[PDB]
Amino acid sequence: PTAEQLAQWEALKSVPIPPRKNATLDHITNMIMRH
RNA sequence: GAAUUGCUAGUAAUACGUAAAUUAGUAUGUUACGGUGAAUAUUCUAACUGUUUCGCACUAAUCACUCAUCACGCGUUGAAA
């Protein structure tokens, strides 16, 4: 592995994975949705 | 309001369309095709099935089998004025 990409991986070691969606808002919109 | 349909799923739903079969002609039916795309949680009840316990005089097997009744005769034995 290159050092720049090792540094990138080190930086992302600590970061939590961002959420795909807001589960509560997803639930509410799916409750609004029809058809 | 009785009533009823379907129930994790690319399913339901969709004032989403598209195609084909059957036709000379007619689809709101059928079968295909993709687009968008959810919700909910199952205390309960259960025919029926499979193991089982026990009983059994049934064995063509309970619509079973034995027992008893009623009549018809043919016998046998007993008591007898």
Cα dihedral A23, A29, A31, A33 in deg (nearest 10): -140
Distance of CA A29 to the CA centre of its chain: 20
Nucleotide B16: closest residue by CA–C1': A35
d(C-alpha A17, C-alpha A27), whole Å: 21
Q: How many CA atoms lie within 13 A of A15 on its CB side?
A: 8
Q: How far is the CA of A10 from the C1' of B63 (A)?
A: 88
Q: How far apart, in Å, do the first and last CA atoms of chain A sit? A: 50
Q: Give the CA A8 to C1' B7 distance in Å.
A: 47
Structure tokens at A26: 């997803």
Technique employed here was cryo-EM
